[PDB]
A = this chain, B = another copy of it.
């Protein structure tokens, strides 16, 4: 069939028209072969513009449409629907970016920008002619979800999904769920105990009939695509029989080896056989073989005979339709900011260490004390933005929660010791959500917490007392302060968790400049990822507080439940396929695909390659590497791209 093209040039008000001579581009478009219609309009994505194309498709029996406007990354779907509504296959539509790529970057070179627009229209028209009608692929959706990360975000996703009746699997790396929230004493702005909100949720999730909790486990492999993922979970060896274990802890009293408690950030000492924290779920014990001496003293006191040193990790194979990544975050390591002396001075601590210090169930028994002499500090300084809003450490973002937790812990210290003087060294107080500004007002008016606008330059320890001096400018007075303190708290920012690299590679997701996971679109798809069937929830997507993380957990459950509820999803057909009449089975394509879609096979007595359509994500690497030209990626065929290259210089 001979191409019948319709070229539409958008002015985008004056965004394009003001730089590109759109009427002139339209005239030029008509001089190209197969162009039956060419029209310029103020807003092509508007109702009049869409109706103009739909009407022309029918009235001029068009089989190709070219929209010379903004980016396909913005309106490709809009125009796809528009043409499909008129009966034109959506893959016979071609976008020409003359705004972001031309009018907006060549504002002071109008003539050349008009010439460039003409070439881009010609390049599009050149590819358009050889475009083909394609049909989306329909795949079934396994009615099961997988949540990776047992923090408040992941727990929320698992609870909502299980409450909806969907079989859900929740994988948690450490021996207990709860995440960083479990480590906090109180939570802003209500000053509720972390346990107040988190523990009931941990309880519910552990006994949910639709949720299978795999604690002390890790996802080691994920293969497949949306609705058809095959996952491998490694159930790490605890060396204790969970079904037999009571969680009494008679064993903890007998164990003679001491290991630094990770949950207490190295400020606590645990045993080889342990329970992360007293309210841990599952309320079971674990043996750290890295430090266990195998004396068997713990076994002598265990009544149910649960201790088994011959335990081997189990690989569980599970099939899931959707996956929610909620692996959380890690606290920034402030050793790098050498001027603040963390790791050098004993009385300089991070706010997360302080949380464990101020928590009743912590190592110091809820007593804030100096690590140098064990004495309670009479004077405390909080340093805001440590590891955030700082280019020298590579973190040019706001860690979101540091202003609030600094004020919260200051309130908590004042309730326990009103005589304690607390000074917060800040740049901006970010109390931006419901009750936050009120919480900020309260810290000063009710608790008498003082605020100094000045990012400190350095901290200096007195080697004889252990006291610290904070050097900073009181910017609101234009004077330099050199106040002494008994303890300095560094309000450390949030950074991605250490395992993030391993999870990224397993799920095939991307990261934003802040190193956290990347959402499909910031404004409209805040929990989806560009990888279909893979969603995000909580701090692994970006620094945020508990209210927001719980909301994301719920949001992810909704988004992840859409494919599950539909039970069928579609996939883009911009995939690779082999022309069997040309493929002589050279085997070059096989190892190029990271998803193993191209495979060698026997057909009619001979060897030929065959792509497993469902495993192809549509990159175009193996067709580019095919020496016979038998392999082609629909919508990005070598001939299609060849004509596009010719289009820049001449009409095809």
Task: Using CB atoms and an 8 Å cutoff, list the residues of chain A in contact with chain B.
Answer: 45-47, 70, 74-75, 77-78, 81, 107, 145, 147-149, 151-158, 160-161, 163-165, 173, 180-181, 185-192, 196-197, 199-201, 203, 218-222, 225-227, 229, 278-279, 388-389, 396-398, 400, 404-405, 407-409, 411-412, 415, 428-439, 441, 475-478, 499, 503, 506-507, 512-514, 516, 521-527, 532-534, 537-540, 542-562, 565-566
Q: Within 8 Å CB of A218, what residues of B?
A: 499
Q: Within 8 Å CB of A412, what residues of B?
A: 185-186, 191
Would B566 and A163 count as touching, CB distance under 8 A?
yes
Would B553 and A156 count as touching, CB distance under 8 A?
yes
Would B523 and A190 count as touching, CB distance under 8 A?
yes
Would A558 and B554 count as touching, CB distance under 8 A?
yes
Would A559 and B554 count as touching, CB distance under 8 A?
yes
Q: What are 30 contact pairs spanning A and B, CB under 8 A? A: A45-B196, A145-B560, A149-B538, A152-B549, A152-B553, A153-B556, A155-B553, A157-B553, A157-B556, A157-B557, A160-B562, A163-B565, A186-B408, A189-B435, A189-B438, A189-B439, A190-B522, A192-B523, A220-B506, A226-B533, A227-B533, A396-B438, A396-B441, A397-B436, A433-B542, A434-B512, A438-B513, A475-B476, A524-B546, A524-B547
Would B523 and A197 count as touching, CB distance under 8 A?
yes
Smallest CB separation, A137 vs chain B (Å): 12
Nearest 6 pairs of A and B residues by beta carbon: A153-B538, A156-B553, A226-B533, A554-B555, A160-B557, A558-B558
Would A397 and B438 count as touching, CB distance under 8 A?
yes
Interchain CB contact (< 8 A) of A546 among B158, B226, B506, B523: B523
Apart from A189-B404, A428-B428, what are 15 other A-B pairs with CB-CB below 8 Å?
A149-B537, A156-B549, A157-B557, A164-B558, A181-B546, A187-B408, A189-B436, A222-B507, A430-B430, A433-B543, A433-B544, A434-B512, A435-B514, A526-B550, A555-B555
Q: Within 8 Å CB of A165, what residues of B?
A: 565-566
Smallest CB separation, A539 vs chain B (Å): 7
Q: Within 8 Å CB of A431, what residues of B?
A: 398
Interchain CB contact (< 8 A) of A188 among B197, B226, B405: B405
Smallest CB separation, A455 vs chain B (Å): 13
Q: Within 8 Å CB of A438, what residues of B?
A: 189, 396-397, 513
Would A429 and B432 count as touching, CB distance under 8 A?
no
Q: Within 8 Å CB of A441, what residues of B?
A: 396
Smallest CB separation, A508 vs chain B (Å): 8
Q: Within 8 Å CB of A478, what residues of B?
A: 476-478
Would A400 and B432 count as touching, CB distance under 8 A?
yes
Interchain CB contact (< 8 A) of A522 among B151, B189, B524: B189
Q: Which has the most chain B C-beta neighbours within 10 Å: A164, A503, A543?
A: A164
Smallest CB separation, A478 vs chain B (Å): 6
Interchain CB contact (< 8 A) of A549 among B153, B428, B477: B153
Would A153 and B532 count as touching, CB distance under 8 A?
no
Can you name the residue of chain B whose Cβ is closest to the Cβ of A407?
B188
Q: Within 8 Å CB of A153, what residues of B?
A: 537-540, 549-550, 552-553, 556
Would B538 and A154 count as touching, CB distance under 8 A?
yes
Do A506 and B221 contact each other (CB < 8 Å), given the known contacts A197-B524, A549-B152, A550-B524?
yes
Would B434 and A514 count as touching, CB distance under 8 A?
yes
Would B565 and A151 count as touching, CB distance under 8 A?
no
Smallest CB separation, A246 vs chain B (Å): 11
Would B45 and A516 count as touching, CB distance under 8 A?
no
Interchain CB contact (< 8 A) of A191 among B151, B411, B539, B565: B411
Q: Which has the most chain B C-beta neighbours within 10 Å: A181, A219, A433?
A: A433
Interchain CB contact (< 8 A) of A523 among B225, B408, B547: B547
Do A540 and B191 contact each other (CB < 8 Å), given the known contacts A165-B566, A229-B533?
no
Would B47 and A279 count as touching, CB distance under 8 A?
yes
Can you name the residue of chain B whose Cβ is closest to the Cβ of A396?
B438
Q: Within 8 Å CB of A160, what residues of B?
A: 553-554, 557-559, 562
